[PDB]
């Protein structure tokens, strides 16, 4: 059953650096695709960032670009957020989610969402 | 030249397919041919080289996708490739590689590109070595062609062969400190696409790291793991 | 002899196809179109003996070895289309992926008016013969990396099939019942 | 024979050391002489062919601790050394051979074992091929001897190679589902100490897997993965 | 030359030797008793130039290379005790490990009356020299294996010194600021 | 040699290129696009020593003569973009004009796949050599001619890039204050 | 051949053995212990064909002769034991005893690092060929004479496991059911 | 900050096998050996395994021997326990446990442990 577990965010200074990570278990974590999403106060869901399986290749949203890296551990199943050059726009809460494309199409579905993690850049 | 060129086209071929281009731009073709020697002062000749399945393989790197958009007027990473692999790509392998002694490298590149006739910009990749790099200061962008470079035409070409055989006087060198060859792979000018063109220019990155000799010596296995800081 | 049939190169399933139904059509085609990025696998496609009709009768009018696999592709670019894959073009049933596929059998192609190519997969089996049954012999995959690049244009999407043939043996062994006939 | 014996004592070396017996029991050697070839029908001399350091270095397995107490009347496992690879000790260079075609395997096997002058009981070996294999019906034990015997004697020795060429007539075969030589370190008689001796058998398994013929092309490179079953 | 006496095949501290404090004195000697089981690790010593003893003094003499460096082990057993072990042992700063090490350099010892080894580390690292700094040059990793089989016996443990050389090279190079002096 | 350096065939300012700014960028480019009419000016390049990047740290590190200057041009145009100018490409100083400057060294280039030229401006000096000074060794003219013919098609602009090398001579002489340096 | 198997030096029951039970086990194994003195016998052994089970399965697929029978015996002593007896080893069926055994075929072995000893009976039978019945081929007998001698040492017992063989004819005659098998 | 989190562990018929998971936090997993202690109904502690590091060595108790399997996933930090074989005398709570030889010694100090999985073989 799908627990996907959320830390380290915290409040921090613009220019600031974090590390969010997000656990999962319940589901074989290594065949999965996984994603960043975040909401904003006063605003809806933005997808960040996905990583594809064996942390091959990852997208990221023009906004987050060259700021953000996601990186998975596999041996501890578990998924990354580095968060450089940290702006206020960036502000919002965090929620890790795994998605899975089904039989053999190329739509990948989210399944289960974490808790949120919140990311006060100010 | 004659287009199609000689010095062109090309070809490289290994297990377990034959991959033909259209043709390397050109070539960044091997110039006063100075290696500085394979064996130099400095390997007494003593060395432990390779020549191995997987280097020449392929880096078999991705690369940078450019578009008609970015100008001019652009760098390039490095793509050390051995610290492309390390950090990324790590080519089971190249991770038990990665897992030895200062390294003899040259390249050996291939940078493939592909959208149609319809496109047209080059993109001037270049060989500097060990970086010290900045990409402001566009005197660096005029400074080079001197460095290994091959070039790139939608217009006129898929596949482009950049060749470099090793930098760095010390004949052999520390990894995880130095930076041997950096080949950047720029554009002077960009790409436009019209619509009789294809839509994509997708970049990848081939090297092929060819002829690297290592000094100590460790255990390297094609498994990768060991033992390198 | 038989092996001319099996063997005069063929074409292939490969794979069904996310058709048209020009997948059956097809079959010897992935599609090669363009693409967000170019690394990303598009394909996936297991060889058997059994399976892709071509491969299935001859296998089933026999239960041994003796072969190669020969997958030599082509390619409906146009001036305007053009494309560059890499396939892999598998044996025998490792590692599912990316770089393992790339450390195997190997063939660097240009997809522009050459419209061949060879790569040959041959069976790495530790026996001789592999016998007919249902698991799998093992994957070939294909990555299209580079898309096509080009014109105005041709419209967008390009398409390959692929080839089939073993050397070098061409000669097999045991016959069994051959996939067509009467009774 | 004579102690210290010929056959007996024994050497193995390779990177990077010497290591020195006081000899093997004896030797489990060989006999009339039917490895069957290494070419047969079979491999067409087609196969692909190893010989390759790691699989030389050894299997460098541990082996079961046998004491005063077990008796008399014992078996044990098979030590497929292949299977046991996969399953464990796995030799990063293993783990990147293991993840290919069916393999051509001879042994070659060493087996270390030293309590002191003071013990005494030896450890009968054997090497029966596939393994049927079930522990009672002793009946087993006395059938070998036919399969390669080397022998331990606590009172005299430090030391024992057991080598094994290859059995399963099929000239090469599929792993995860069969199992050739399968290397039985058994006692006979139990070793006992008294009190001038090493308090300590302590078993080591060393396998020396020589020769390894595989017969698909695949990916095998001295890393570790790929693609198998 | 300066080599035979850095050369002339030394003894080692290695490791500061979990001491009687017998393990100055030692200093050569890892210790050899019976064991639980005989995998266990006991051992890991680092290696250079700076550090133990004799090392020290010739590695501040010069600060280049040429050379090998040669451990050859020596026991001291009994009839009565025995042993076995082996030894890495380590060139240059690798994997730390099991068998890593035992992929490396290698030597397999008997020890009863041989009572000699040679286990040569080479320096297998990026430049022909390496300087003297304070990080590591690398580790060098024994393992005791098997213990002692035995007799009666002997007072159980039973220990070995460590023996240390280079080749090839003798000869190095930069002279530097001697460990003995005056002022 | 420093020659080489120089010398192998470099790319050039020329100008300060109305940039994008991809005259930095360019430099070597002038611009090509279609013209209201083919034969009009756009170009007038001044070439020294001094001035332009690479000559200039040259130029400061001697102050006389050993050569003669090649200016070679490359072309990115396309199957569709095509092109033809003339370039003077002229030496020292003279009419800076139309017939003159065609009177002048010569070359003429196509621009399709040939993607290079040679024109070489001699220093046709009163003596073998000038010094470095600051009114102007000369200038180089290029002249668009005819655009760019074409397609559908490429976006519009085509440009160009110049190259510069000296023979024959090779060698200079007197060496001064070299641009690059410390203090 | 057959031969081999039979041949290839086997071990045998002997007898049933006060087993531990180690007397399956053993089989090959009479006990060497100290003695009161050491002469006394302990052991007696029968052999047939049938009975002991190698030999069991030969002799019933064949029932006649060609051969000889060795027994050769080695031993587990330690430096610390050691021991010296004689065996018989004895043909057919005579005298069971003392003298007219040691009159026998012989051997004298002295139990130290040899390991190995040649006692090979023959079949001395008014016919070339004994046939598979019942009541006896012969007798084999073992005398432990004198035990072992010492140490501090070992304990005490000693065992020995026997080995048996024939030539000259390893050829034997007329197929009949062999012990293993299916039904 | 240490969290071992252990489940898995049920109620068993006699003749049965469980596997107990116990996964980890806050501590480089990979570095520290580990070990499964159990505690009976009536009973005092009872060391069962450890493993070691690498999941290269590993020890048993005499009862627990060739029943019971230890494994560590270090991907994904994470300790198993395959116990076959269950006889009754097998009752506990069972706890996993995470143990340091400090610097160059050979004890090995439990410092943290998991909150204990119950297992009635009955």
């Known amino acids: 059953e799908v627990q996907l577990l959320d830390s380290g965010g915290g409040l921090v200074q613009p220019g600031g650096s974090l590390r969010l990570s997000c656990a999962a278990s319940?589901?074989?974590?290594?065949?999965?695709?996984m994603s960043w999403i975040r909401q904003a106060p006063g605003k809806g869901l933005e997808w960040v960032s996905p990583?594809?399986?064996?942390?091959?290749?990852?997208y990221y949203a023009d906004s987050v670009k060259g700021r953000f890296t996601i990186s998975r551990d596999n041996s501890e199943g578990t998924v990354y957020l580095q968060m450089n050059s940290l702006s206020p726009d960036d502000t919002a809460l965090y929620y890790c989610?795994?998605?899975?494309?089904?039989?053999?199409?190329?739509?990948?579905?989210?399944?289960?969402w974490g808790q949120g993690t919140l990311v006060t850049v100010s | 030249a004659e287009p199609e060129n000689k010095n062109v086209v090309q070809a490289t071929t290994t297990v377990n397919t034959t991959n033909l281009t259209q043709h390397p731009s050109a070539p960044t073709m091997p110039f006063s041919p100075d290696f500085s020697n394979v064996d130099n002062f400095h390997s007494m000749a003593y060395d432990i080289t390779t020549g191995d399945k997987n280097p020449s393989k392929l880096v078999r790197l991705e690369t940078h996708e450019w578009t008609p958009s970015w100008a001019r007027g652009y760098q390039i990473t490095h793509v050390e490739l051995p610290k492309v692999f390390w950090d990324h790509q790590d080519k089971p392998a190249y991770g038990q590689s990665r897992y030895f002694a200062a390294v003899r490298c040259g390249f050996h590149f291939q940078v493939q590109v592909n959208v149609n006739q319809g496109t047209a910009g080059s993109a001037l990749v270049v060989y500097e070595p060990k970086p010290v790099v900045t990409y402001d200061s566009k005197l660096e962008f005029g400074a080079f062609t001197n460095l290994p470079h091959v070039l790139m035409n939608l217009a006129e070409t898929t596949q482009a062969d950049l060749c470099i055989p090793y930098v760095a006087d010390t004949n052999y060198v520390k990894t995880d400190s130095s930076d041997l060859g950096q080949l950047k792979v720029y554009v002077w000018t960009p790409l436009s696409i019209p619509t009789g063109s294809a839509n994509q220019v997708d970049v990848t990155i081939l090297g092929s790291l060819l002829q690297l000799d290592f000094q100590n010596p460790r255990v390297f296995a094609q498994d990768v793991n060991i033992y390198d800081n | 002899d038989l092996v001319k049939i099996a063997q005069l190169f063929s074409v292939m399933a490969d794979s069904t196809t996310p058709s048209e139904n020009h997948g059956v059509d097809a079959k010897g085609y992935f599609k090669w179109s363009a693409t967000t990025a170019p690394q990303s696998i598009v394909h996936r496609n297991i060889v058997y003996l059994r399976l892709f009709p071509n491969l299935n009768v001859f296998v089933n009018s026999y239960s041994y070895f003796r072969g190669s696999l020969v997958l030599r592709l082509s390619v409906y670019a146009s001036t305007f289309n053009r494309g560059r894959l890499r396939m892999g073009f598998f044996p025998n049933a490792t590692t599912d992926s990316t770089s393992t596929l790339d450390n195997a059998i190997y063939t660097i192609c240009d997809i522009g008016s050459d419209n061949s190519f060879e790569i040959t997969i041959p069976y790495s089996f530790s026996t001789w013969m592999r016998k007919t049954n249902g698991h799998p012999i093992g994957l070939f995959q294909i990555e299209v990396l580079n898309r096509l690049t080009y014109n105005s244009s041709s419209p967008s999407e390009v398409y390959c099939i692929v080839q089939g043939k073993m050397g070098q043996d061409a000669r097999f062994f045991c016959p069994t019942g051959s996939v067509v006939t009467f009774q | 024979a004579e102690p210290e014996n010929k056959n007996v004592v024994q050497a193995t070396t390779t990177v990077n050391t010497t290591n020195l017996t006081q000899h093997p029991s004896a030797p489990t050697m060989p006999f009339s002489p039917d490895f069957s070839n290494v070419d047969n029908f079979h491999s067409m001399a087609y196969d692909i062919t190893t010989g390759d350091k790691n699989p030389s270095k050894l299997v460098r397995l541990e082996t079961h601790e046998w004491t005063p107490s077990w008796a008399r009347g014992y078996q044990i496992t098979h030590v497929e050394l292949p299977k046991v690879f996969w399953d464990h000790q796995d030799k990063p260079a293993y783990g990147q051979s293991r993840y290919f075609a069916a393999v051509r395997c001879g042994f070659h096997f060493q087996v270390q074992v030293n309590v002191n002058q003071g013990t005494a009981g030896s450890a009968l070996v054997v090497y029966e091929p596939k393994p049927v294999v079930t522990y009672d019906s002793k009946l087993e034990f006395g059938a070998f001897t036919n399969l390669p015997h080397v022998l331990m004697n606590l009172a005299e020795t430090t030391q024992a190679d057991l080598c094994i060429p290859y059995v399963a007539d099929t000239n090469y075969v599929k792993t995860d589902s069969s199992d050739l030589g399968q290397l039985k370190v058994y006692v006979w008689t139990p070793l006992s100490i008294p009190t001038g001796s090493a308090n300590q058998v302590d078993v080591t398994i060393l396998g020396s897997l020589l020769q390894l013929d595989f017969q698909n092309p695949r990916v095998f490179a001295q890393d570790v993965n790929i693609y198998d079953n | 030359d300066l080599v035979k006496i850095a050369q002339l095949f030394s003894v080692m501290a290695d490791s500061t030797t979990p001491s009687e404090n017998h393990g100055v004195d030692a200093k050569g000697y890892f210790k050899w008793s019976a064991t639980t089981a005989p995998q266990s690790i006991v051992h890991r010593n680092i290696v250079y130039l700076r550090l133990f003893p004799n090392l020290n003094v010739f590695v501040n003499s010069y600060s280049y290379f040429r050379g090998s460096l040669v451990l050859r082990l020596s026991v001291y057993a009994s009839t009565f005790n025995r042993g076995r072990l082996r030894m890495g042992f380590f060139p240059n700063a690798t994997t730390d490990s099991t068998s890593t090490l035992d992929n490396a350099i290698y030597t397999i010892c008997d020890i009863g009356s041989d009572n000699s080894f040679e286990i040569t580390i080479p320096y297998s690292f990026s430049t022909w020299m390496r300087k003297t700094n304070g990080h590591p040059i690398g580790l060098f990793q024994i393992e005791v294996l098997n213990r002692l089989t035995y007799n009666s016996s002997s007072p159980s443990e039973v220990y070995c010194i460590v023996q240390g050389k280079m080749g090839q090279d003798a000869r190095f190079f930069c002279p530097t600021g001697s460990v003995v002096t005056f002022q | 040699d420093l020659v080489k350096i120089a010398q192998l065939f470099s790319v050039m300012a020329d100008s300060t290129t109305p940039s994008e700014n991809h005259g930095v960028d360019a430099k070597g480019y002038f611009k090509w696009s279609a013209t209201t009419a083919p034969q009009s000016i756009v170009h007038r390049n001044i070439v020294y020593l001094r001035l332009f990047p690479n000559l200039n740290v040259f130029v400061n590190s001697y102050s006389y003569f050993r050569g003669s200057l090649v200016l070679r041009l490359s072309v990115y145009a396309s199957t569709f973009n095509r092109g033809r100018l003339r370039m003077g490409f002229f030496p020292n100083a003279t009419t800076d004009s139309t017939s003159t400057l065609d009177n002048a060294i010569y070359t003429i280039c196509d621009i399709g796949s040939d993607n290079s030229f040679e024109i070489t401006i001699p220093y046709s000096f009163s003596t073998w050599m000038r010094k470095t000074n600051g009114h102007p060794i000369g200038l180089f003219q290029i002249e668009v001619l005819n655009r760019l013919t074409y397609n559908s098609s490429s976006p519009s602009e085509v440009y160009c890039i110049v190259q510069g090398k000296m023979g024959q001579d090779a060698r200079f002489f007197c060496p001064t204050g070299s641009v690059v340096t410390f203090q | 051949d057959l031969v081999k198997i039979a041949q290839l030096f086997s071990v045998m029951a002997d007898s049933t053995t006060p087993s531990e039970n180690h007397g399956v086990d053993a089989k090959g194994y009479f006990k060497w212990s100290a003695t009161t003195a050491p002469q006394s016998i302990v052991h007696r052994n029968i052999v047939y064909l049938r009975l002991f089970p190698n030999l069991n399965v030969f002799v019933n697929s064949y029932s006649y002769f060609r051969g000889s029978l060795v027994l050769r015996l080695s031993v587990y002593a330690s430096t610390f034991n050691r021991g010296r007896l004689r065996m018989g080893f004895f043909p057919n069926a005579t005298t069971d005893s003392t003298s007219t055994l040691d009159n026998a075929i012989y051997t004298i072995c002295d139990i130290g690092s040899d390991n190995s000893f040649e006692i090979t009976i023959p079949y001395s039978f008014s016919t070339w060929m004994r046939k598979t019945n019942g009541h006896p081929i012969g007798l084999f007998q073992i005398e432990v004479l004198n035990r072992l001698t010492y140490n501090s040492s070992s304990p005490s017992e000693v065992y020995c496991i026997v080995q048996g063989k024939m030539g000259q004819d390893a050829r034997f005659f007329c197929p009949t059911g062999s012990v293993v098998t299916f039904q | 900050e240490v969290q071992l989190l252990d489940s898995g562990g049920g109620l068993v018929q006699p003749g049965g096998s469980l596997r107990l998971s116990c996964?980890?936090?806050?501590?480089?997993?990979?570095?520290?050996?580990?070990?499964?202690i159990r505690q009976a109904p009536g009973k005092g502690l009872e060391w069962?395994?450890?493993?070691?590091?690498?999941?290269?060595?590993?020890?048993?108790?005499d009862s627990v021997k060739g029943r019971f399997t230890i494994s560590r996933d270090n991907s994904e930090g994470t300790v198993y326990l395959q116990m076959n074989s269950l006889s009754p005398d097998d009752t506990a709570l069972?706890?996993?446990?995470?143990?340091?030889?400090?610097?160059?010694?050979?004890?090995?100090?439990?410092?943290?442990?998991?909150?204990g999985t119950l297992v009635t073989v009955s």
């Open positions: 989610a795994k998605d899975g494309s089904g039989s053999h199409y190329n739509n990948n579905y989210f399944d289960s």
């Open positions: 319940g589901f074989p974590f290594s065949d999965y695709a």
């Open positions: 990583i594809s399986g064996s942390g091959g290749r990852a």
